[PDB]
């Protein structure tokens, strides 16, 4: 239940299917990573609480807690947790997805699929969204943030 970034694993052997963020007792990941399945954490079980396919997000144990947003000007850091490698920070200036409903920050970083759900951070260390729902032009990920 400790705050932090976590690998999401499945089991013959084990494979990393994604990543997520524990904050304020709630686990946050992308819907496409877990498809809303319950998760084991040690001897305990985490059940889904809120989710939305269109936003590609899901929270476990409580409502979505992450609310910071990219300021539109500053570099950010992808806290990537790739399969089989230690967590690492990659700094970048986001581009932009321009949509009919407004602009969304986007990172032009292409990491292994099992990295989906990794958090993107502002300079204060706040999570401004999760990595792994995007488009191909190279892959570009939206900075996907939910609503608190």
């Amino acid at each position: 239940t400790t705050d932090g970034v976590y690998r999401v694993m499945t089991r013959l052997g084990s494979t990393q299917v994604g990543v997520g963020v524990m904050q304020e007792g709630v686990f946050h990941t992308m819907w496409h990573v877990t498809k809303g399945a319950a998760l084991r954490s040690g001897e305990g079980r985490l059940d889904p609480y809120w989710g939305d396919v269109k936003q590609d997000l899901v929270s476990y144990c409580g409502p979505w807690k992450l609310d910071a947003a990219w300021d539109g000007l500053s570099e950010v850091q992808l806290l990537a947790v790739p399969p089989g490698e230690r967590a690492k920070n990659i700094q970048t200036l986001p581009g932009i997805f321009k949509t009919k409903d407004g602009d969304i920050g986007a990172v032009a970083l292409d990491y292994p699929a099992g990295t989906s759900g990794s958090p993107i951070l502002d300079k204060s260390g706040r999570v401004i969204g999760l990595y792994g729902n995007g488009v191909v032009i190279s892959y570009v990920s939206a900075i996907t943030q939910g609503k608190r």
Binding site: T92, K98, L109, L121
Partner: protein, 39 residues
């Protein structure tokens, strides 16, 4: 079955590798959560 393993703190790192572009792209988001390019 699906399980979680802690991998680190959520912290900014002053010595991070820096990379990547900042493209500006017109996109649409459909009901299935899929982004596509628009022209």
């Amino acid at each position: 079955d699906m399980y979680i393993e802690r991998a680190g703190d959520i912290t900014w790192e002053k010595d991070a590798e820096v990379t990547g572009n900042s493209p500006r792209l017109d996109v649409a988001l459909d009901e299935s959560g899929d982004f596509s390019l628009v022209e």
